[PDB]
Amino acid sequence: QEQLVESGGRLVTPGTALTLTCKVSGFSLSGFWLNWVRQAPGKGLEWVGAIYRGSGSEWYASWAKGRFTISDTSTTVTLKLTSPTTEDTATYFCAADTTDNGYFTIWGPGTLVTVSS
Amino acid sequence: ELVMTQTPSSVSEPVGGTVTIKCQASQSISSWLSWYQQKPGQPPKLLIYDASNLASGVPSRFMGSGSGTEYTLTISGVQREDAATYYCLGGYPAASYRTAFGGGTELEII
Amino acid sequence: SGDSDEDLLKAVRLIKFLYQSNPPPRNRRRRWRERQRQIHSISERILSTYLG
């Protein structure tokens, strides 16, 4: 049934544009919020942003705006890191809201991004 | 804009004890509050939704409550498997103040 | 000013899209009503965040 798989996690030099993909499968729903959450090693969860899948409605955290672009595809949602820094080193998870009520019911296992000079 | 202040940072409780975890919202979020459990190497798991509703397949020992700006996660009879890190999530993506996670609570079991 | 102005416009456009995803159709009407009540409370709550 409902499944999320993130891919694209690599070791990158700071400023190297990188795209992560969230493969979206088994969702009966058409429109729903597909969220991006990051976790730096040994740190807490941080909300990056979300897109409401039926539309082109993108929403970003104050710190994320300009540095991250969420894009919707037919069977995928991507997160592009426009110009990463060492501070962007994290596991990136995609999380789906299945009700439109704000909470995350389905999560992907995560994809690790390392940013070193 | 929205800040979720989560307290305490760490808690140590023996088996069968009660754990109280608090989240304070910097803005009025109403029932836009959920609780998550995260264990090492795993993605987080939903515990509580709409501030006080128990999620599908979660032990009855996990309780959520909210009064105005203050939200509480209570674990009544703590078990060894409850050793994890806990997070609240407040707000909504399209709200003026966005959505935000609390800083988390690391629970250790004696 | 402009960031908040844009957000509010983006939020209303999103609210309209949600209403447009619930077009009117016994069991189907009960289902339709539940979903409208839900979109209404979400809209009311989203909008309140921009009203103070």
Side-chain angles (χ1 to χ4, degrees):
Chain A
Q1 19 263 265
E2 290 98 59
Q3 205 176 87
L4 300 175
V5 189
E6 47 299 77
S7 67
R10 282 145 59 182
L11 165 66
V12 285
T13 61
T16 302
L18 206 218
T19 304
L20 312 180
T21 140
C22 180
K23 198 177 162 183
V24 183
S25 84
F27 286 78
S28 308
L29 305 138
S30 310
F32 63 93
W33 284 114
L34 187 285
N35 304 254
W36 281 102
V37 178
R38 82 172 182 183
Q39 190 168 37
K43 296 281 182 177
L45 302 168
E46 284 183 67
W47 184 81
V48 180
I51 189 156
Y52 193 89
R53 271 178 54 86
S55 52
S57 199
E58 292 153 65
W59 294 79
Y60 298 93
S62 63
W63 60 268
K65 65 192 187 196
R67 327 215 288 105
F68 296 83
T69 298
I70 300 165
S71 187
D72 199 23
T73 278
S74 184
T75 51
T76 259
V77 173
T78 63
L79 175 74
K80 190 203 174 178
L81 285 69
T82 81
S83 176
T85 69
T86 55
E87 288 128 68
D88 301 316
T89 293
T91 288
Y92 290 77
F93 304 94
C94 54
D97 169 357
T98 60
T99 63
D100 302 332
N101 293 329
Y103 63 95
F104 312 165
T105 52
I106 291 114
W107 293 74
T111 205
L112 172 75
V113 174
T114 317
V115 191
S116 73
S117 36
Chain B
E1 183 90 70
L2 189 248
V3 171
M4 298 301 310
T5 301
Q6 186 170 345
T7 55
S9 276
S10 47
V11 41
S12 298
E13 200 66 32
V15 168
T18 73
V19 160
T20 302
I21 300 156
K22 288 192 176 177
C23 268
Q24 218 217 296
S26 67
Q27 240 105 70
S28 192
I29 56 162
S30 179
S31 62
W32 277 334
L33 191 109
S34 51
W35 291 100
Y36 301 85
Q37 185 198 245
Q38 194 187 29
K39 298 191 184 183
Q42 284 188 358
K45 184 195 168 183
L46 181 73
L47 298 176
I48 305 295
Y49 67 97
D50 303 343
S52 53
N53 296 323
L54 188 63
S56 178
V58 177
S60 57
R61 71 184 170 268
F62 293 89
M63 286 112 174
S65 80
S67 172
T69 246
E70 192 201 79
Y71 300 89
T72 309
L73 176 67
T74 303
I75 314 160
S76 89
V78 300
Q79 295 312 121
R80 288 259 227 272
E81 62 263 39
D82 303 341
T85 143
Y86 297 82
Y87 301 95
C88 67
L89 172 74
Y92 199 73
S96 60
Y97 50 65
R98 301 302 183 265
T99 184
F101 283 103
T105 302
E106 201 180 321
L107 165 63
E108 190 199 350
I109 289 124
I110 309 154
Chain C
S1 26
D3 282 352
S4 35
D5 278 0
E6 186 56 58
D7 286 343
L8 179 60
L9 279 176
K10 264 206 275 146
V12 163
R13 290 184 291 205
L14 172 71
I15 289 154
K16 280 163 125 180
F17 175 94
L18 295 176
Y19 276 122
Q20 277 289 301
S21 292
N22 192 44
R26 277 114 175 169
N27 256 38
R28 280 197 269 273
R29 230 209 112 79
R30 285 185 192 179
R31 281 163 68 260
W32 180 86
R33 273 192 261 94
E34 282 173 34
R35 176 59 175 160
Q36 273 298 103
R37 286 185 219 116
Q38 185 206 5
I39 304 160
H40 169 94
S41 58
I42 292 170
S43 307
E44 195 182 78
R45 295 174 74 172
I46 290 175
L47 292 181
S48 73
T49 78
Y50 292 94
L51 307 164

